Amino acid sequence: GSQWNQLQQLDTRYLEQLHQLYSDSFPMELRQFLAPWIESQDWAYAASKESHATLVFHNLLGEIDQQYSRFLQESNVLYQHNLRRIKQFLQSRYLEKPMEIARIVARCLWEESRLLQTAATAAQ
Amino acid sequence: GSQWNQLQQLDTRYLEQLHQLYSDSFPMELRQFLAPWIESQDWAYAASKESHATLVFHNLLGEIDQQYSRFLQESNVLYQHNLRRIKQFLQSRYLEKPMEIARIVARCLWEESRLLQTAATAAQ
Ligand code: NI
């Protein structure tokens, strides 16, 4: 989950591009809260076949539920309200199209790398 | 402490209502990142005079840019992302009618005090 760490140290003139990579399907809250879990899997691979996307999506929902219990401890009402919304949004839209949500995540991670490659080679 | 914290430390039964209260009217992100400032404002008055509402509004935005300023150097991209969502939300929906948000936020706080009382009276 170091990729999210790098992105947090992005140069001030790249953040707006970073803020735009996320969306209601893949909120930035999700990208951070489960960054470890997210970076553990090959998303391009999970998006290649329906079988892989179906399982990944099933577990994403599990990780979101596991985090819901986490912020429930912290009394992080805010983040309980967010994950609650996020989970409901993901279910109604991707429970019959797990490949679609997989593509989105895959695309975002590719974009984060592509963005980092710009800032990285921007040291000349 | 703030009235927001007192609400966070509420029974799981009271939270459901706390969440239903911020489903539409205004983002709980705002209610939380600016709880101190939000609570230190006469919204009932700001709701009756348009010019005052515009000025309280201008101030709310100012407070946002202040935090956004800090979070920018602390490299807390997720917090910046929340603030950014608040501005776009306020900019499009209340810049041309600040008195509206003035009423909404006024109401919400009125509804929060109710939760604090029902919860307090439940201490018997
Ligand atoms: Ni000004």
Curated annotation (Swiss-Prot), chains A, B:
Disruption phenotype: Early embryonic lethality, day 6.5-7.5. Conditional, tissue specific mutants are variably viable and show diverse defects including obesity, diabetes, thermal dysregulation and infertility. The modification N6-acetyllysine is found at residues 49, 87. It is found in: Cytoplasm; Nucleus. Induction: Induced by methicillin-resistant S.aureus infection in the lung. Expressed in ventricular cardiomyocytes (at protein level). Expressed in the lung (at protein level). Expressed in the liver, spleen and kidney. Involved in the gp130-mediated signaling pathway. Belongs to the transcription factor STAT family. This is Signal transducer and activator of transcription 3. It comes from Mus musculus. The chain holds residues 3 to 124 of 770 of the full protein.
